[PDB]
């Protein structure tokens, strides 16, 4: 019964487990932190910036792709401004080799068919949704995220199916889900990238009010096991304590983790600067100065596990559970 | 062997689990918060105000009755003064009674358009003589609460009430065992209040007894359902997220006590010192804004789980255990 | 994998309420350790200098428990304390009021107040025991932190032989094999409690320790099937652990620290506010502390339908709480 | 991937077994190899802030093992690992008498160790040490995920087959064989050994010591090889636990951060070792025997005459995660 087999089911967070070290002939220099989400969406680092208005504008989106990651423009702005941001990220020096100057010192840039760097944009389910997407695709966007707090509402699985039949070339990133059965629902709907983030962090703290949610580690693990039957990558929204948890997330079966908070202090994020230092997280600095901490930490984490790439990381991953007594320290 | 088998019983409270979502066609607005306790005892929201001295009198009950819930008028004053308060919540509406229906659409009344009201009665020697006045004031639910919750003493006075005049709804508590929940049902109980031990009632520090509430609710609700009997969960409800768990654990309604303390509709004088008012404790204010909050978020939880009514919620209720670092 | 076994304390469990036919009046909280060792309350004062001397032994007896005279004193001076207790109540006409004054007082066949003693485990021990039985002391203890000590067993073998009719309380143990070895030494009463890290540092420096619910159950099981009672040493914070310890199989609960600042403690008094010196503030009479415990014991067994302690530990039903139980 | 359990030191308590042993009898004398016979199961960590030549002298005086730290030139390296060798021969009778428990070589010269890196430089460093009659070297690093360690060990082993190469640092069974079959007669156990460990996130990997120690000591004992605990130990109880878990010797640094012999300056009315300012902890002999006592005390309750006695005979239980600090 669905009233008998419920209670015993156990959940798990990132902090509750540790990755078991392996015989490593692999070094952080050698390791590959690249993941393929699509032909269009070829990332060189497993990171995406959230589509938050306090996280990613055009100033922020460019910085991510310059490194090799991905920027998701926020939907909390007029389409005119929104459609411009995407193409502004697309027009910086993107789509041409003419500016070798920009090619000269951003080694691991992630790019599309035209050699343009990759940018994504958030699209709401608010009633005039398609018009907000027609401007972005024609702004040559590479991806859009149809996400709500109702991240698995029929309406949010609706405007996914209403787009795939409409658009051949658009990569639909869907979310958020918490279960493997909810992963399939998005994928069958027309989702080539699935996002896991129900009660991920404080982004949708419905645990205290709605009382709903699934522990992120298991949420990442379960969904990834289902999305692999279609070769579809998953996005690890929230749950991350530090970059050591990136190592735990990318081993559960994830291709990319997406972050918001860690971008609250960088200069490329929206927020009037002030010399003490705070925006309108106080300050963090250049995005290039924060990224290598995330990457370096992941490099050694898989250099510890003998993972050359992110694929072998998942196939040959074993965890070990910590007791609830002395885990905080 | 109650010596070599006792140890393995593991318990759980609401703050140890989470409700797993479902493929939801259902959304908050559509869902129905309505809940039925009996023939004359039926609500529109799964909320009752506890029978405490600082929480519920005629003032609180009227608001609760109109908001769709129920109030339980305490047993610590004159019988006539408990009779004076009941009918006051009864003669609020009496059927060309028109204006108040527009005031709030969720009103919970009887078959004669009269707002429902409950009341606790002590289980002492002069109980039935105090219930005596309550049944004349047409109270819709009597509560048999005592420092002794399930013990034989409380079961005695359910047999006496039901055997003599069986018109009224007998609510009795508290139980924690399925065996205990059923025993009152056989006595004459129609709705059962569940809750022995909150984890900080306060009967675990210097008594060492009790049952974790989440398990206590499930264990009682499962057994009571064998007789088609509804149950009330009493205690363990920390916030808005735990009500949904309590409601998914099997409970029909969720009775809250201290949550309605500083609420404006609580009995007692009002004292102002700061800006925010205070009670003779933070003046919460109009009961609605808290109740609306308690149900406006409840719709989200059910919408997440894809339930249009409290029915679907329990049949397909799925939980997930909070691990070690998840507790923190 | 020799790590799997789980050890519980009283902080790890609760008692599940049972069907009760017992009111707080009906229970007998009387307890027997031996034919010459019977008590009216399941309490013992620890054999410490901050805890028990003559007056504490008198007071504890006058409440129904047993006082264990501590051995940090001369051989003559320990016999002196024993003397006072035995000559406390004649059994005649002069001391009848005390019988009226304290109904629950525990005594021997000749109406003399029961008193326990305590000795070391050296060559000097017998010469101390000499003076103790000379003034007719009832119980004797040879207690330290050591668990399966070979030294204590050697003494019990020597003490029981010299005095076949004497209540030897050895301790402390936390294993069945050790408890089995003590009964195999001639003892008839067992102290149980090795390394409760909640209070002492046995676990910190030695790494050795046993959680006090596991130790009690493991020892009470081994001792019971040979007609032997046990005592739970260390790990009781209030009435809660006490009831849990008694249901775990323990006949008596020995307390020292909690009793340390009581009026009958050997500690001196000085002021403002009252305090007990040589540090602990002042509480009051031992009687208040006792009926803060025993009264709660009547409440604990009451929710369980037990009318006697035998009824309790036989039909005890433990529930194992969850991780976030007290935290929330 | 997730049901696998890992235990720390705070997870375990040692359970008292047949105490047929007493501290006047028990031996903490531990062996690593024929040329490495220790009298106390401790090893100083080769760190800038832990071991100098002076510290290597005092450590061995009690029968431990001082590993000279790497962060110096090869010149001043071998100068330090030669001072300890010619610190005493029996030429000075009292200087031999004053420290009877001392650990020594064939000529009665103090036992020494030298911290050596993986790299191309190391052979020149190692050879300079073997010229200074070094007893052992440690080829350990957190940079061990470059298998150069394994490459170096055998490389060094081929050249020096009578050398006491200490390899590390591992925490799994399959990596143990990799080190052992590489020629490492001593294998270091531990990944994540910080007083606070941040490598589990900053670097990104780690495993609880008790699990690490026990598991690595399983395959290491199947083919006769002793394991060693690195850091990870805070109290004397932590010593007894992992030792019983199949370990022969424990390594510490931070705990002995501000000793007299430890590198650092003594400043001031209180004394502080500016080694980051660590208060004075006394002579090494003092800060050591506050452990060995508790170590001898832990084996007593278990009833072990030695560590092999302890390793074989000891068994473990598990505490509860619900309360640990609050229940203390």
Describe the structure concisely for a colleague.
Chain A has 329 residues and is α/β, with parallel strands linked by helices. Helix content of chain A is 31%, strand content 14%.
Give an account of the 3D structure.
- Chain C: Its EC number is 1.1.1.205.
- Chain C: One of its GO terms (biological process) is GTP biosynthetic process.
- 4 copies of one chain form a homotetramer.
- With 329 residues, chain A is α/β, with parallel strands linked by helices.
- Chain A has one domain (1-329): TIM Barrel (Alpha-Beta Barrel), CATH 3.20.20.70.
- Chain A has 10 helices and 12 strands.
- The first copy, chain A, has helices spanning 58-67, 79-91, 100-103, 129-137, 154-164, 180-190, 216-227, 243-252, 287-303, 310-315; strands at 17-19, 35-36, 42-43, 47-49, 70-73, 119-123, 143-147, 171-177, 193-196, 234-237, 256-259, 319-322.
- The first copy, chain A, has an 8-stranded parallel beta barrel, surrounded by 7 helices.
- In chain A, a hairpin with a 5-residue loop joins β2 and β3.
- The longest helix of chain A has 17 residues, at 287-303.
- The radius of gyration of chain A is 19 Å and the shape is globular.
- Chains in contact: A-B, A-D, B-C, C-D.
- The B-C interface holds B 2-3, 6-13, 15-16, 148-153, 176-177, 179-180, 183, 196-197, 199-200, 203-212, 238, 322, 324, 327 and C 8, 10, 13-21, 23, 217, 221, 238-244, 247, 292-293, 296, 299-300, 302-304, 313-328.
- β12 of chain A pairs parallel with β1 of chain D, so a sheet runs across the interface.
